[PDB]
Design an enzyme around this catalytic site. Structure first.
Site, PDB file in Angstrom:
ATOM      1  N   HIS A 118       0.813  -1.211   0.000  1.00  0.00           N
ATOM      2  CA  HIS A 118       0.000   0.000   0.000  1.00  0.00           C
ATOM      3  C   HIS A 118       0.848   1.263   0.000  1.00  0.00           C
ATOM      4  CE1 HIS A 118      -2.694   3.152   1.314  1.00  0.00           C
ATOM      5  NE2 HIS A 118      -2.094   3.217   2.488  1.00  0.00           N
ATOM      6  N   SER A 174      -0.061  -0.901  -6.615  1.00  0.00           N
ATOM      7  CA  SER A 174       0.106  -2.090  -7.429  1.00  0.00           C
ATOM      8  C   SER A 174       0.666  -1.735  -8.801  1.00  0.00           C
ATOM      9  CB  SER A 174      -1.227  -2.819  -7.585  1.00  0.00           C
ATOM     10  OG  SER A 174      -1.089  -3.952  -8.420  1.00  0.00           O
ATOM     11  N   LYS A 179     -14.849  -7.222  -9.484  1.00  0.00           N
ATOM     12  CA  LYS A 179     -13.940  -8.150 -10.165  1.00  0.00           C
ATOM     13  C   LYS A 179     -13.491  -9.272  -9.228  1.00  0.00           C
ATOM     14  CE  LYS A 179     -10.659  -6.997 -13.046  1.00  0.00           C
ATOM     15  NZ  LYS A 179     -11.045  -7.470 -14.401  1.00  0.00           N
ATOM     16  N   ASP A 180     -13.158  -8.910  -7.981  1.00  0.00           N
ATOM     17  CA  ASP A 180     -12.857  -9.901  -6.954  1.00  0.00           C
ATOM     18  C   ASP A 180     -14.049 -10.803  -6.681  1.00  0.00           C
ATOM     19  OD1 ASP A 180     -10.289  -8.940  -6.662  1.00  0.00           O
ATOM     20  OD2 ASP A 180     -10.780  -7.649  -4.960  1.00  0.00           O
ATOM     21  N   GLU A 235       2.580 -34.555  -0.325  1.00  0.00           N
ATOM     22  CA  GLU A 235       1.511 -33.898  -1.063  1.00  0.00           C
ATOM     23  C   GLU A 235       2.113 -33.041  -2.182  1.00  0.00           C
ATOM     24  OE1 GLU A 235      -1.741 -34.545  -0.444  1.00  0.00           O
ATOM     25  OE2 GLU A 235      -2.598 -33.043  -1.794  1.00  0.00           O
TER      26      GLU A 235
END
Ligand SMILES: CCCCCCCCCCCCCCCC(=O)OC[C@H](COP(=O)([O-])OCC[N+](C)(C)C)OC(=O)CCCCCCCCCCCCCCC
Ligand SMILES: CCCCCCCCCCCCCCCC(=O)OC[C@H](COP(=O)([O-])OCC[N+](C)(C)C)OC(=O)CCCCCCCCCCCCCCC
Ligand SMILES: CCCCCCCCCCCCCCCC(=O)OC[C@H](COP(=O)([O-])OCC[N+](C)(C)C)OC(=O)CCCCCCCCCCCCCCC
Ligand SMILES: CCCCCCCCCCCCCCCC(=O)OC[C@H](COP(=O)(O)OCCN)OC(=O)CCCCCCCCCCCCCCC
Ligand SMILES: CCCCCCCCCCCCCCCC(=O)OC[C@H](COP(=O)(O)OCCN)OC(=O)CCCCCCCCCCCCCCC
Ligand SMILES: CCCCCCCCCCCCCCCC(=O)OC[C@H](COP(=O)(O)OCCN)OC(=O)CCCCCCCCCCCCCCC
Ligand code: HEC
Ligand code: HEM
Ligand code: HEM
Lengths: 57, 385, 62, 93, 247, 75, 50
Positions: free
Chosen positions: B202, B206, B228-229, B272
């Site tokens: 922040h 971005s 969008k999220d 895994e």
């Protein structure tokens, strides 16, 4: 006749979320019973009630 | 001013998730962080509602897991959400890291963001291993003792460290109680590290999928990127609901439901699948101390990636050669994960050695050479002297 | 090009810019999404707190 | 509060970008627009344009690594048959 | 390694529960419990399956209660101190045939028969592997292999030699409903019962999956629509740049 | 009046053109390994040739022919 | 019994005192249970079985 629909449903937010919640009530109940009725009729003869009636008759 | 900007908690929530100015041109790859936060909250919630029933003895671990599976109400849902959301957590995390090292967001203003992310990656590999060794199956116990016997290759100090870590002489009741305490504890360190990730992001904003400045025209977070999220959250929930309800055991090994017996070895001790490339990097070179330190170098060689990129354009969007070699590296990582599942056999040992050399040479050898070549090619194609 | 002459939008526009019709359509869509998400959130919350009730062995030995 | 070090992103009003003049930005409210405008045209044509521009960079490394993996796997399945046991000893030592 | 040490891969049979919408055949679960009680109860334990999960799946409540009286269980002792034994109720577990694991190894030539409560879930292949393992015993192993004494041959067992002899013969049991008991019929019924006792959550899991993916896919389509609606003001903005006059 | 359906189906698929060829390969194995087993010095050879390659090929063909039809034949 | 050494008795005395009690050993080759004399790791036994 769209102004009356917008006025009585989407004008104030309280009747909007109340309509959403009442639709959630009736939708959840009829959707649950419809999907279980379809799931128990897609398998006919394979469920325990059908096997029980088969060995009881 | 507004109450969402005046009140101290609401000013933080506002400045982070409401009107945080995001760049205007970010595509669907930037939603993987929101997906990772949602899936971390999913893991924590289902883990708490399973740990209300899980007892962590050596006589009750696997029996308590199959008591969760059979007798508690909707416990099959909780266990399959945990055991499949861990796999989906690591796949969305791999997408997050690959987006970060494809679009050039390890570069000059967010190297501390990249380093905090690598710390998060180490911590979640650790707690994922501890959670896989909580359940105490046949893969579980022998995978634990294989990589702690790996950890005992330190020359002077190694046996003392491994018999401090086991809590005894082999993987037993103190090791399983220890691993349950640590598997609870580490995700509440990851929550603080994700808060640190968000702060270190922040402060700078971005990146965008072009490299160029996003500071010209940006877009607030609330009415656009939350939706969008929402699109990608409902898609991820649909794929997760498929993998939970219609084929739950198609990801995990079909040998973890054998109860942990420390006498028999199951002839294939693979972990895994998200630890399979690092397990192949481990099994590449034949010595053991060099193997564990090259596994740790394979983990924290993402830290040399900011200092080794010599490209003056941010990101591989407008590059060709580095696009080609990046996808070579990604499919090499997938091949490495494939090699980590097979036995140490006739082409597999050589394929593992060559694949881990290509993995270690993408960061050190291939990327500054091709970035320098692309810089010189851009200059001599642009100017006419 | 003048700064008062707008570019064309006649492909992204609709022919009838009714307020009530378009607003009712958009709010019916967001309300349908809210209805499905409300039923889903209710069912997953009652799943999570139906896990915390009496397990079947306790109900057996009741 | 403490004014910390300057970064390359401010807030709304002073975002630290370059000064711009003469860039007019026209927009239209979505209630006046039609969403799903051209989803079948852009589903057939634009998706093919993006797939045409960006599939060699994905399919050439996938082809290389898949052919390498398939050749190695079928060589291993050849070697652990009966027609490769002398080759098995020769590759062992 | 070699396919002999890998085990022959079991084929893909056509089960009555293979699919996103189908369920278990509950009559096959009842007949498979009969095949388990008459054939596999001599060696194999089944401990994580209580008597009460069998009610409403394969037998009625009176049938399960009359079946649980046949077994003794350890009671909390009486006023004098010496231990007592009681007939079993519904909340108890299905008992194993051996008191410990040393007796299980002593009565079966050193090989411990595994607990069958999770045997189609802890095996590669699952019910196809269990069915092909039960049926695919050859009458004599092929020419060349040598087995230890007391070990039989089965190609689907990884290793070649299993310690379990071929037990499912023709008309070993007789079904109470009239189904002819071959060895393939008994094998299919007992592996459907083992599939049930390994995952009893099958019906409710596929039903809740149908509900959840219908709701979530409809939510995905509606959320795609609302995303395109909220971004319709941003996908279609137009920039016009005339160059400014110099100062 | 009724016995196994699986053995009938394997016996039916042991008479096709592919099945007879795979069976013939398996008994080429069988008598070759029997002749090689008859010879003196069989206590140590460094490589005692078994025959599971041909049995696995035959059983794999039989099971990939047998997998759809059997559960339709069953009850 | 191992807490008792170095405090009130010596190691030989506690190892001689632990032999007088019998404890449950895991069963042998046949399956029937066996008894064993106690070692230093087992607890001090109570006089009543329940
Ligand atoms: C892989 C599936 C997706 C492949 C793909 O779609 O690649 C094409 C894009 C191109 O990138 P782009 O941002 O679209 O640039 C083109 C933009 N134009 C100029 C046209 C306007 O490239 C991308 O979309 C970037 C995706 C790369 C990251 C996702 C793949 C992750 C796979 C797992 C990787 C694991 C890495 C482990 C690291 C430790
Ligand atoms: C708790 C964290 C985990 C859970 C986290 C959950 C996700 C994060 C919280 C999301 C909660 C969403 C609440 C939305 C509040 C709201 O303002 O709803 C109004 C909307 C329509 O609002 P609008 O689109 O702006 O239209 C208004 C304009 N009119 C029509 C008046 C002209 O009407 C609707 O939205 C329809 C009702 C839909 C109901 C919401 C479904 C989800 C409920 C979740 C509740 C969670 C909060 C619980 C708190 C104890
Ligand atoms: C998808 C199949 C499309 C095949 C290509 C084709 O038929 O031509 C394109 C048309 C245009 O459809 P479009 O992509 O939504 O564009 C909208 C047209 N405007 C409003 C911009 C003028 O596409 C169509 O109108 C096809 C509509 C088919 C609807 C049912 C699909 C199932
Ligand atoms: C009860 C309803 C009361 C409504 C009163 C009202 O309407 O709240 C109006 C106020 C703003 O008011 P104002 O600034 O216009 O007042 C000016 C007076 N001088 O918004 C609020 O309080 C809260 C803002 C809501 C949006 C943020 C919600 C965040 C929730 C926390 C989520 C945290 C998750 C991440 C961690
Ligand atoms: C952060 C905290 C939440 C984390 C977990 C939820 C998010 C991940 C969900 C992934 C899908 C698995 C569903 C598990 C629950 C279940 O079994 O859903 C079953 C129900 C229907 O079942 P029912 O009503 O018949 O029975 C309920 C009693 N067994 O499906 C749904 O209504 C849709 C569920 C998905 C919609 C979620 C909407 C957002 C919720 C946010 C909180
Ligand atoms: C150390 C150096 C070693 C170098 C060795 C080679 C390394 C890889 C070199 C680059 C490989 C990809 C080249 C093509 C790039 C591409 O994707 O082209 C894709 C091109 C078009 O693309 P466009 O953008 O013109 O489409 C613009 C569309 N509007 O489809 C074709 O032509 C057709 C297919 C040809 C086969
Ligand atoms: C003894 C009198 C037995 C009867 C009757 C049955 N089984 Fe058995 N089984 C037995 C032993 C001693 C072993 C151990 C062999 C080994 O090395 O594992 C087994 C093994 C199995 C297995 C395990 C196969 C695997 O891959 O692990 C299964 C799935 C199994 N047995 C199932 C089974 C069924 C379904 C039976 C009857 C309907 C049955 N067994 C009979 C001993 C005996
Ligand atoms: C970082 C997020 C987490 C990840 C990636 C994670 C991953 C895992 C994995 C892979 C397993 C093994 C599942 C299996 O048997 O296949 C597991 C087990 C377990 N985890 Fe977690 N876990 C996380 C967080 C938590 C937290 C915070 C808790 C505690 C509240 C928790 C509780 C458990 C429990 C109780 C088990 C026991 C076995 C089971 O019932 O699944 N998990 N975890
Ligand atoms: C628990 C796991 C993680 C969470 C919750 C998380 C969260 C986030 C979020 C929300 C963002 C902003 C959205 C975005 O830009 O995509 C972000 C950005 C970023 N994260 Fe993560 N992250 C996690 C793990 C990682 C890892 C493992 C790395 C890599 C080492 C990493 C590196 C980055 C980078 C580089 C960015 C900036 C992307 C950009 O702006 O271009 N993160 N993270």
């Amino acid at each position: 006749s769209f102004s009356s629909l917008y006025k009585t449903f989407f004008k104030r937010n309280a009747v909007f979320v109340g309509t959403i919640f009442a639709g959630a009530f009736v939708f959840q109940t009829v959707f649950d019973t419809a999907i279980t009725s379809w799931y128990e009729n897609h398998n006919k003869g394979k469920l325990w009630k059908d096997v029980k009636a088969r060995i009881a008759a | 001013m507004a109450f969402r900007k005046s009140n101290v908690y609401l000013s933080l929530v506002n400045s982070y998730i409401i009107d945080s100015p995001q760049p205007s041109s970010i595509n669907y790859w930037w939603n993987m962080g929101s997906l990772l936060g949602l899936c971390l909250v999913i893991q924590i919630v289902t883990g708490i509602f399973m740990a209300m029933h899980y007892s962590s003895n050596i006589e009750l671990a696997f029996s308590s897991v199959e008591h969760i599976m059979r007798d508690v109400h909707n416990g099959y849902i909780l266990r399959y959400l945990h055991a499949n959301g861990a796999s989906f957590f690591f796949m969305v995390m791999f997408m997050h890291m690959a987006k970060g090292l494809y679009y050039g967001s390890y570069r000059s203003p967010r190297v501390t963001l990249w380093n905090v992310g690598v710390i998060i990656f180490i911590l979640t590999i650790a707690t994922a291993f501890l959670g896989y060794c909580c359940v105490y199956g046949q893969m579980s116990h022998w995978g634990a003792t294989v990589i702690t016997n790996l950890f005992s290759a330190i020359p002077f100090v190694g046996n003392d460290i491994v018999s401090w870590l086991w809590g005894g002489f082999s993987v037993s009741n103190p090791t399983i109680q220890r691993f349950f305490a640590l598997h609870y504890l580490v995700p509440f360190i990851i929550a603080a590290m994700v808060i640190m990730h968000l702060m270190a992001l922040h402060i700078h904003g971005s990146s965008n999928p072009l490299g160029i400045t996003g500071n010209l025209d940006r877009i607030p977070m609330h009415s656009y990127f939350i939706f969008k999220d929402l699109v990608t959250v409902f898609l991820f929930m649909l794929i997760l609901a498929l993998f939970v309800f219609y084929s739950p055991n198609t990801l995990g090994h079909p040998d973890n439901y054998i109860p942990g017996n420390p006498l028999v070895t199951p002839a294939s001790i693979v972990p895994e699948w998200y630890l399979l490339p690092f397990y192949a990097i481990l099994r590449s070179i034949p010595d053991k101390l060099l193997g564990v330190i090259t596994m740790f170098a394979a983990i924290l060689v993402l830290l040399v990636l900011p200092f080794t990129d010599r490209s003056v354009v941010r990101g591989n969007t407008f590059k060709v050669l580095s696009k080609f070699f990046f996808f070579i590296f990604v499919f090499n990582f997938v091949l490495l994960g494939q090699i980590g599942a097979c036995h140490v056999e006739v082409p597999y040992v050589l394929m593992g050695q060559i694949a881990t050399f290509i993995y270690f040479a993408y960061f050190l050898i291939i990327v500054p050479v091709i970035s320098t070549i692309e810089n010189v090619l851009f200059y001599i194609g642009r100017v006419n002297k | 090009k003048s700064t008062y002459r707008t570019p064309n939008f006649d492909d992204v526009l609709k022919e009838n810019n009714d307020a009530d019709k378009g607003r009712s359509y958009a709010y019916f869509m967001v309300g349908a999404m809210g209805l499905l998400s409300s039923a889903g959130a209710k069912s997953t919350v009652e799943t999570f707190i139906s896990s915390m009730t009496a397990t079947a062995d306790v109900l057996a030995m009741a | 509060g403490p004014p910390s070090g300057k970064t390359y992103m401010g807030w709304w009003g002073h975002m630290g970008g370059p000064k711009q003049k003469g860039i007019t930005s026209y927009a239209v409210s979505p209630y006046a627009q039609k969403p799903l405008q051209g989803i079948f045209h852009n589903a057939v044509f634009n998706s093919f344009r993006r797939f045409k521009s960006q599939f060699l960079y994905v399919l050439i490394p996938a082809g290389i690594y898949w052919y390498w993996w398939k050749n190695g796997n079928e060589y291993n399945e050849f070697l652990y048959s009966k027609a490769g046991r002398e080759e098995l000893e020769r590759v062992n030592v | 390694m070699t396919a002999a040490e890998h085990g022959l891969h079991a084929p893909a049979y056509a089960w009555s529960h293979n699919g996103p919408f189908e369920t278990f055949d509950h009559a096959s679960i009842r007949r498979g419990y009969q095949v388990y009680r008459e054939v596999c109860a001599a060696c194999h334990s089944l401990d994580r399956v209580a008597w009460r999960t069998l009610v409403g799946v394969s037998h009625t409540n009176e049938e399960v209660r009359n079946m649980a009286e046949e077994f003794e269980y350890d009671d909390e002792p009486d006023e004098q101190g010496n231990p007592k034994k009681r007939p079993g109720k519904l909340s108890d577990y299905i008992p194993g045939p051996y008191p410990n694991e040393q007796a299980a190894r002593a009565a079966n030539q050193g090989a411990l028969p595994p607990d069958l409560s999770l045997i189609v879930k802890a095996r590669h292949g699952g019910c196809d592997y269990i069915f092909s393992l039960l049926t695919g015993y050859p009458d004599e192993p092929p020419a060349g292999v040598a087995l230890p004494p007391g070990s039989n041959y089965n190609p689907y067992f990884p290793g070649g030699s299993i310690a379990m002899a071929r037990v499912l013969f023709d008309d070993m049991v007789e079904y109470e409903d009239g189904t002819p008991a071959t060895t393939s019929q008994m094998a299919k019924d007992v592996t459907t019962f083992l599939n049930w006792c390994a995952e009893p959550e099958h019906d409710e899991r596929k039903r809740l999956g149908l509900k959840t993916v219908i709701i979530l896919s409809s939510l995905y389509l509606l959320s795609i629509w609302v995303k395109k609606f909220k971004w319709a003001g941003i996908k279609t903005r137009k920039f016009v740049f005339n160059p400014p006059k110099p100062r | 009046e009724v016995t196994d359906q699986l053995e009938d189906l394997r016996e039916h698929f042991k008479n096709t053109e592919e099945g007879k060829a795979l069976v013939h390969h398996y008994e080429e194995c069988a008598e070759r390994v029997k002749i090689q087993q008859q010879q003196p010095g069989y206590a140590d050879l460094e490589h005692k040739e078994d025959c599971v390659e041909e049995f696995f090929h035959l059983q794999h063909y039989l099971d990939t022919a047998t997998a759809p039809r059997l559960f339709d034949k069953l009850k």
